């Protein structure tokens, strides 16, 4: 889902995948509904789209 219909990294990707798992900042008690994603999409996304 995250690869095909959200944001694709290329097959010959040269770069670092720097990411931290934060629970203090981006979590609201009741739900941060601002952050959003897609489940259904009729096209597999090419990289950097």
């Amino acid at each position, epitope marked *: 889902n995250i690869a095909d219909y959200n944001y694709k990294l290329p097959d010959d990707f040269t770069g670092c995948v720097i990411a931290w798992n934060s629970n*203090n*900042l981006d*979590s*609201k*008690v*009741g739900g*941060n509904y*601002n952050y959003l994603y897609r489940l259904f999409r009729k096209s597999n996304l090419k990289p950097f789209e």
Partner: antibody
Amino acid sequence: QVQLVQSGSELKKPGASVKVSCKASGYTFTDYGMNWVRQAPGQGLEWMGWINTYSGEPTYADDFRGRFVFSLDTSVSTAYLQICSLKAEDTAVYYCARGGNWDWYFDVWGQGTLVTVS
Amino acid sequence: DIQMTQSPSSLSASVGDRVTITCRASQSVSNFLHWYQQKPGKAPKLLIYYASQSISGVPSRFSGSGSGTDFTLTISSLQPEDFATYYCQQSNTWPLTFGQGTKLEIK
């Protein structure tokens, strides 16, 4: 009406540990954050850290990472700060602030705990 | 880390005039800045949030505008009972930085 009462003017030794109060009323206490700022009389406001209102984790600012401890007591809407091992340079007031996780503006209303140390 | 400055430091004003105070940021805070007012011996209160919009429940003698690194508000009708130290507050990057202050004084 939303207002945040505070404790009286503390006056203790350089080396004791006291606990100021910030009691909340009127709004949803579990919605927003509970930031704290301090103000020296020869200086201005400095952001010093916030706490989440359901877990109570005390994340601090990058400058004062040490002796300061926030303690949350839920379902009473009290937001106590616990300063420990006071020094001679800590003769500053401490203001209470409601600053949420999404909007992050302070709006400091707080009467001012006159922490005089000698 | 934002060196947040404001000019002029101490300016005077009279009754019912149109004053303009500006406040400048080193880095881009493009649409997130808040304006505060602080009387001596009194806790502050929000005036203008996000540099354009205003809170309900404030006297609307003033309005705010600005983007980029240049931010201001214009008090279109000043009254002598203000005499207060005005503060800016951005909302873009940690740590959160205030301004030094523009204290208004009567002649």
